[PDB]
Design a binder for this molecule. Structure first.
Ligand SMILES: [Mg+2]
Ligand SMILES: [Zn+2]
Lengths: 147, 49, 49, 48, 1110, 147
RNA sequence: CCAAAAGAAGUCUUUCUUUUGGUUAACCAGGAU
DNA sequence: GAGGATAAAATACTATATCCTGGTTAAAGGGTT
DNA sequence: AACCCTTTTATATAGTATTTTATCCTC
């Protein structure tokens, strides 16, 4: 329903978020452990504070500075890629990290009762062995070819 | 789930609500206070409001 | 918590001796610590109620 | 003194154990840096 | 009485004190000079423990060395720690932000076991902080104090419990070491002595017993007397050293390879080796004492031996059986009983030296690890001691001790008593101790073993009650850390003067009488029955023939702070505790006045606090000035003492010093030569003597409030001086060149009028909130290569001029004259933290008077804020026209059980007007035992009533009956102590007489000027847009969760909505409501708070798909 | 069976799938909610979540490089395990194993710690707040006032 | 929404135009009712 | 003698009133530029 | 000779709830 909310409010539904939803929220990908350049005090590119992903750090200005006026609005600079808008958008835009290998969510594994164990009928000890690379697990076996 | 999460055991309440896909109707005093509305008690009810 | 069979035999107008004052400090400190724990517990109970 | 006339102000003392820990009074200017409280409400606020 | 120059303060004391109070700071100094091993400590130990004098550093080094490799082909040893002179004196260290320390050198010797080539060197071991003569350390300029810690002694502790099912007693033991593993025996439902080695899992005792190499026949030969042991052995299971060893190995190792010899490698490594298991000397001493093991021999080693374990098992089984005495072969018999962990024979004290020793130990451990890792890699026959010694861990440990510990705290310098009490504090909480939110009521109580070793009154009132205490006056600490007290031993009913220091256990064995007992001038009690203290602290009447000892005096169970409350035996403990805790909050006043009625402890506390200047050597004064005193010693030499004038303390008060000697007076060694913050001629003076009435007055002194006269404001009776310190520094930064200058961008000239030619404000210039104290600008950064601009800077020569004025501004709610400016600089090769080029410090001083809401207090826990300050004319005045200074309410006295104040009041009057007992024809009966020299006193006399031996009620009544007239033949106060007052406001006399007198009241550090705060709009937080908090920024008062329930209960919905939406975090509602108010419109409707959206984002960041529907 | 049926029926009744327990992408909170601010002297004050995000990204990039470059399965498994631990420390620090500590040997604040406890969002910021037009001071007796 | 600079008008000091700049947190400790 | 069922113990997590102010916010080593 | 990355046993109880495990009963 309402995205940013104008205060007419019917429900507040909660649920699990799939990878598709995570990539739908995101405005970009973070792929560099850089935060700020300490020689010009401006955020790095593709870092945790990238202006292209999260938005401009100043009202109506881009990274390359080709645009600095209010007349320019809703247009993405073709050189730096930063969208010209107000700085408050830095409080609203999210990023995402594309993991190279799958990872489990700790809330649903460590928390007692282990809700991954109940779903799969696995004791916590063996499950912890599997997900931290301390034992193998048979994910399938073919009975037709078996005998 | 919002009132329960704000009372105690936020992690367990949140995880089981996420699994159950619970929906909150926002009818309690605490929830309306959290979301910034007029509580359904005293002067905030329809009869007087 | 059991009574000292001595007992304290002087009023605070006359002035207690050293031993009587010492054996009075027991109850004094017990009361103070009880008061602190009691205020904390009362706050928590009201919050749950 | 013209503005504060008949403009209530809420006085509160923590911990607010019960309802009467918050009460509205009509303000009046005084000399000093301490708030002056009526002696008959001290039981309600539990304020010595 | 012993100080050369002291005021003559007559005393009501009846008894005589055999022992003079020791040095009140002896704990700190004598526990530190043991650590370094000074000659003074060596002499002190010679007349006591000459058998083995060794300092802490020597112990640590000789426990460390020798350091050898696995092959044993090379060794490194340390010895002979040595100290050089301190780098700079105390004043220079404190002024220039320099830590007070001395160089440390040790002798490192390396020996090769295959060549015999010895290499000895003197290796520098870092700068070791040193303790001043006043028991404080000086770290980074600040004066810090290391608190003594109450810990549980290491050793064997037996205990008993009751089981829910069996309803039978269950006994248990625990051997708790210092830095080692635990072995806990016990007895449970079915008789099975079971070990719990290293808190892993229960097993039969037989497994461990056999693993040590005992045959089952031997087991039943020695322990074959308890059905428990016979049952366990006859049903154990296995047999054989290797089999039991393997069982223990499986229990210990988590499914590790069952190697047989690994069983030994673990069994002996965990307990019997001398690297992973240590009992120390106190632990071994306690174990030997408890089990009655070898006594004649002294300490030779501290590591568990099989004999100790088997003796412990025998002790446990015999305790469970029901026996009351035990003997172990080759040892004396010892009683069989359980142990209490709250006894003061089991709670030892880690002092300032033994706490530094542990940190040096861990530092040396890391150094040893580095040494033995570098031993192999470095080539042989190329090794010298300098190469292998890595000093950084040791200095890192020593530096992180005195900056980040709960036992090293900023000295509390509110006034001399605050610091003196801070140095004599025993805290049960800290690293290695219990926690404030985890301790029960059984450890906060006052054990009957505290008598004379820790004051039962003085303790915090808040949630720390019982966890922090203060050492008593006469107590000392013995080498093992156990507190002792002196007792005067009585022989055959003759009270000798042989003082013997006893600890808790010795006191427990004997019978101790009271100090205030009827001695008959020949050391013999008047009557046979005298109150005594028995083994368990029981109080009884024993005929005066079994007594073994007596207290050296009353006032032995109380601390320094509680020894300065006159008439303490007439106050309840609850009020005495508050009165003692509130004497260390009093602020120093401009002019000091010693009390008319004291207790004689003021002089000693003032002298031992160290806030006065004492003539080091006798001589004659040459020059006296407000800045210095010059003393000409008898033999040529001259000594100049400098004074601390208007110096700030750790808590922002004044630290004045002023001479009290003339240019011709002759001084004597130990004499007071200059007062301090809260002293009056050498005696502590925390407050003033005020004329007080005890009537209720128009309801202004209602419910603990107070009424003062306006005289006390006109005459600056209770005025004080406070000093605030502000700092700013210039730092390089990658951009570089931080500057302090007048040239500040975007600043006009009217706001640069006070600043002098190079920034900093001028001295004597009064400032207001928001002003600039030090002008400072830092590079604006944002280095941008703009074509036209950049090309101009490069070749044309355009300057950057990128500046951002990060000036120093006086914060909100402050003002006052600028009295001092201290500016450092890198130019003059001053020592500053790395990367800092300049450092400026500005002091601002204020003079505060007493005003409504300021908190006052007496010495008896009678606190209360100032309700009103009446003009002098409309105050109750005596018959001669004297107005009273303060009015106190009657209803608070009888209910709180602190009648002592009234007595003080009465005596105050007799001290003020003066008296003369008429011994015309025989001294009156009531003055029969009143010491002569008290039969007449002049007006404004100073008297003293020791804490538990003072003026009786009969003596007070007599003195009130006879007192001098004022100017004419008028006696204003009758025999009852009450005077007829006139109503200064209506003129009519009050119908009944009122109680008037003189009371000594103090001014607490809870002034209103620091408490008042208001806000309409101001700064807002960043992550959530709610207002800030605190007076310094601005901030709003919290509208918590408990205040929201009250509004809901009232039914006020709109008030709560506006409070939580348009007053805290509705980013647009705030500006819209401000505009609506200033324009007179209607207040608009609230929106959505920002914190809710922050919450939604935080939930989405947890991979929860929170969405709001419609 | 009664305990298991709870979670099983929870995942059966609704249209959501259990696959949401295993993550493939990790969302990244907007910068303004984990800000780093300039303290004079060329100093910066991090938000304690930048450290955990950098720890995640470093391991992810290292694993991606080790996979693309080719390497024995053992090293890849070790890297995947460390990535799993880094993500666990991000979501809930200290729940399993030794808490990740920053300067001074103090555990870092994870995302869960922002919502749990007396100092969490719910209790501290949402149910109670600091407000404008407020003051405080010491109280004295006002016998001349009306009720 | 404030500060600084420049220009115009009038008042003998306000308004209009242009340019530039322009807030933290977490821990530990100590107190109070 | 072997397997299932029930007590037991053994660990795992949750919670413990309100408000205010003051001092700190890394060092050491390896590899690289 | 100066960057960038990395990495570094206890004074608690009280309540409940879930997983072993250990032993007892049954076939
Ligand atoms: Mg009160
Ligand atoms: Zn651009």
């Amino acid at each position: 329903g309402a995205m940013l909310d104008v205060n007419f409010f019917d429900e507040l539904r909660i649920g699990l978020a799939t990878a598709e939803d995570i990539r739908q929220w995101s405005y970009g990908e973070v792929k560099k452990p850089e935060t700020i350049n300490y020689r010009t005090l401006k955020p790095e590119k593709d870092g945790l504070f990238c202006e292209k992903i999260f938005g401009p750090t100043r009202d109506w200005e881009c990274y390359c500075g080709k645009y600095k006026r209010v007349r320019f609005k809703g247009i993405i600079c073709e050189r730096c890629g930063v969208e010209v808008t107000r700085a408050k958008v830095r409080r609203e835009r999210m990023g995402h990290i594309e993991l190279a290998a799958p990872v489990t969510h700790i809330w649903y594994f460590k928390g007692v009762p282990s809700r991954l164990g109940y779903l799969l009928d696995l004791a916590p000890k063996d499950l912890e062995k599997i997900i931290y690379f301390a034992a193998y697990v048979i994910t399938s076996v073919d009975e037709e070819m078996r005998h | 789930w919002l009132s329960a999460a704000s009372f105690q055991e936020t992690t367990r309440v949140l995880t089981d609500a996420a699994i159950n896909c619970r929906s909150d109707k926002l009818n309690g005093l605490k929830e309306n206070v959290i979301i910034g509305k007029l509580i359904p008690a005293g002067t905030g009810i329809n009869r007087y409001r | 918590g059991e009574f000292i069979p001595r007992p304290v035999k002087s009023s605070f107008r006359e002035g207690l001796t050293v031993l009587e004052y010492f054996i009075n400090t027991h109850g004094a400190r017990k009361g103070l610590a009880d008061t602190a724990l009691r205020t904390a517990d009362s706050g928590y109970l009201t919050r749950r109620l | 003194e013209e503005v504060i006339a008949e403009h209530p102000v809420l006085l509160n003392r923590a911990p607010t154990l019960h309802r009467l820990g918050i009460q509205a009074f009509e303000p009046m200017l005084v000399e000093g840096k301490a708030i002056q409280l009526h002696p008959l409400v001290c039981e309600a606020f539990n304020a010595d | 009485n012993s100080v050369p120059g002291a005021p003559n303060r007559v005393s009501f004391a009846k008894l005589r004190e055999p022992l003079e109070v020791p040095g009140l700071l002896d704990v700190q100094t004598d526990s530190f000079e043991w650590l370094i091993g000074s000659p003074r400590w060596r002499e002190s130990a010679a007349e006591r423990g000459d058998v083995n004098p060794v300092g802490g550093l020597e112990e640590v080094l000789y426990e460390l060395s020798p350091i050898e490799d696995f092959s044993g082909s090379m060794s490194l040893s340390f010895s002979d720690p040595r100290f050089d002179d301190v780098k700079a004196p105390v004043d220079e260290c404190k002024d220039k932000d320099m830590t007070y320390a001395a160089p440390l050198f040790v002798t490192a010797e390396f020996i090769n076991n295959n060549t015999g080539e010895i290499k000895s060197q003197t290796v520098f071991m870092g700068d070791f902080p040193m303790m001043t003569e006043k028991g404080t350390f000086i770290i980074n300029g600040t004066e810090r104090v290391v608190v003594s810690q109450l810990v549980r002694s290491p050793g064997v502790y037996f205990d008993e419990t009751i089981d829910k099912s069996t309803d039978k007693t269950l006994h248990s033991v625990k051997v708790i070491p210092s830095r080692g593993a635990w072995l806990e025996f016990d007895v449970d439902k079915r008789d099975t002595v079971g070990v719990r080695i290293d808190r892993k899992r229960r097993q039969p005792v037989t497994v461990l017993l056999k693993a040590l190499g005992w045959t089952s026949e031997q087991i039943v030969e020695r322990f074959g007397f308890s059905e428990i042991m016979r049952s366990t052995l006859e049903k154990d299971n296995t047999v054989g050293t290797d089999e039991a060893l393997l069982d223990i190995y499986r229990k210990l190792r988590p499914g590790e390879p069952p190697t047989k010899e690994s069983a030994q490698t673990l069994l002996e490594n965990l307990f019997f080796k001398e690297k992973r298991y240590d009992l120390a000397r106190v632990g071994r001493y306690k174990v030997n004492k408890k089990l009655g093991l070898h006594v004649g021999e002294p300490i030779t080693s501290s590591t568990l031996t099989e004999e100790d374990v088997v003796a412990t098992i025998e002790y446990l089984v015999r305790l469970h059986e029901g026996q009351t005495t035990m003997t172990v072969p080759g040892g004396v018999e010892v009683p069989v009983e359980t142990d209490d962990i709250d006894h003061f024979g089991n709670r030892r004290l880690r002092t300032v030296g033994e706490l530094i020793q542990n940190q040096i130990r861990v530092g040396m451990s890391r150094m040893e690890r580095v040494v033995r890792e570098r031993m192999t890699t470095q080539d042989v026959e190329a090794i010298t001691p300098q190469t292998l010694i890595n000093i950084r861990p040791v200095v890192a440990a020593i530096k992180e001790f005195f900056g980040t510990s709960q036992l090293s705290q900023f000295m509390d310098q509110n006034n001399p008593l605050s610091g003196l009490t801070h140095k004599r504090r025993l805290s049960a909480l800290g690293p290695g101790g219990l926690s404030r939110e985890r301790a029960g009521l059984e450890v906060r109580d006052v054990h009957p073993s505290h008598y004379g070793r820790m004051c039962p009154i003085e303790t915090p009132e808040g949630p720390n009650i019982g966890l922090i205490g203060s050492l008593s006056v006469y107590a000392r600490v013995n080498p093992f850390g156990f507190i002792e007290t002196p007792y005067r031993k009585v022989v055959d009913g003759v009270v000798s003067d042989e003082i013997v220091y006893l600890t808790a256990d010795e006191e427990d064995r004997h019978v101790v009488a009271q100090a205030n007992s009827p001695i008959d001038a020949d050391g013999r009690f008047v009557e046979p029955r005298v109150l005594v203290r028995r083994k368990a602290g029981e109080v009884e009447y024993v005929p005066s023939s079994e007594v073994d000892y007596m207290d050296v005096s009353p006032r032995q169970m109380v601390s320094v702070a509680t020894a300065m409350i006159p008439f303490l035996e007439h106050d309840d403990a609850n009020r005495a505790l508050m009165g003692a805790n509130m004497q260390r909050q009093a602020v120093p006043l401009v002019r000091s006045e010693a009390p008319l009625v004291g207790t004689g402890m003021e002089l000693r506390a003032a002298i031992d606090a160290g806030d006065v200047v004492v003539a080091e050597e006798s001589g004659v004064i040459e020059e006296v000035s407000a800045d210095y005193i010059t003393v000409m010693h008898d033999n040529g030499t001259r000594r100049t003492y400098r004074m601390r004038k208007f110096a700030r303390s750790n808590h922002g008060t004044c630290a004045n010093q002023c001479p009290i000697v003339d240019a011709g007076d002759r001084v004597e060694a130990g004499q007071v030569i200059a007062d301090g913050p809260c002293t009056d001629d050498g005696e502590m003076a925390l407050g003033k003597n005020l004329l007080v009435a005890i009537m209720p007055w128009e309801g202004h002194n209602y419910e603990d409030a107070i009424i003062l006269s306006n005289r006390l404001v006109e005459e600056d009776v209770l005025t004080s001086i406070h000093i605030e310190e502000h700092e700013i520094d210039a730092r390089d930064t990658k951009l570089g060149a931080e500057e302090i200058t007048r040239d500040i961008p975007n600043i006009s000239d009217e706001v640069l009028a006070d600043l002098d030619e190079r920034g900093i404000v001028r001295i004597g210039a009064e400032v207001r909130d928001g002003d600039i104290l030090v002008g400072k600008v830092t590079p604006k950064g944002e280095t941008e290569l703009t074509p036209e601009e950049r090309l101009l800077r490069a070749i044309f020569g355009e300057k950057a001029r990128e500046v951002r004025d990060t000036s120093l501004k006086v914060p909100h709610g402050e003002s006052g004259k600028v009295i001092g400016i201290r500016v450092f600089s890198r130019e003059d090769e001053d020592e500053l933290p790395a990367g800092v080029n300049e450092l400026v410090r500005v002091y601002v001083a204020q003079k505060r008077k007493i005003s409504d809401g300021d908190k006052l207090a007496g010495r008896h826990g009678n606190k209360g804020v100032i309700g009103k300050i009446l003009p002098v004319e409309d105050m109750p005045f005596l018959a001669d026209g004297t107005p009273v200074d303060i009015i106190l309410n009657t209803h608070g006295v009888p209910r709180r059980m602190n009648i002592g104040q009234i007595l003080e009041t009465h005596l105050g009057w007799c001290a003020h007007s003066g008296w003369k007992v008429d011994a015309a024809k025989g001294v009156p009966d009531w003055a029969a035992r009143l010491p002569d020299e008290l039969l007449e006193a002049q007006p404004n006399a100073i008297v003293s009533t020791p804490v538990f031996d003072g003026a009786q009620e009969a003596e007070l009544q007599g003195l009130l009956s006879c007192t001098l007239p004022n100017r004419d033949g008028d006696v204003l106060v009758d025999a009852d102590g009450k005077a007829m007052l006139f109503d200064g406001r209506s003129g009519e006399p009050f119908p009944y007489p009122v109680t008037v007198g003189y009371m000594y009241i103090m001014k607490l550090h809870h002034l209103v000027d620091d408490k008042i705060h208001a806000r309409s709009t101001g700064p807002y937080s960043m992550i959530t847009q709610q207002p800030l908090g605190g007076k310094a920024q601005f901030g709003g008062q919290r509208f918590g969760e408990m205040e929201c329930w009250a509004m809901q209960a009232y039914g006020a919905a709109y008030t709560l909505q506006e409070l939580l939406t348009i007053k805290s975090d509705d980013t647009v509602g705030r500006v819209k409501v401000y505009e609506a108010i200033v324009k007179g419109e209607n207040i608009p409707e609230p929106g959505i708070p920002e914190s809710f959206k922050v919450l939604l984002k935080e939930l989405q960041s947890l991979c929860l798909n929170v969405e709001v529907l419609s | 069976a009664l305990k298991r049926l709870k979670v099983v029926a929870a995942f059966q009744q609704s249209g959501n799938s259990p696959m949401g327990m295993v993550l493939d992408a990790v969302p990244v909170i907007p910068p303004e909610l984990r800000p780093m601010v300039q303290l004079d002297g060329g100093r910066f004050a991090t938000s304690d979540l930048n450290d955990l995000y950098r720890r995640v990204i470093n391991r992810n990039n290292r694993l991606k490089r080790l996979i693309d470059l080719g390497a024995p399965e053992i090293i890849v498994n070790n890297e995947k395990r460390m990535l799993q631990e880094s993500v666990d420390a991000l979501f809930d620090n200290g729940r399993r194993g030794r808490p990740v500590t920053g300067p001074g040997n103090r555990p870092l604040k994870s995302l869960s710690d922002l919502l749990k406890g007396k100092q969490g969002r719910f209790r501290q910021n949402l149910l109670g707040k600091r407000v404008d037009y407020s003051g405080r001071s010491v109280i004295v007796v006002g016998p001349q006032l009306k009720l």
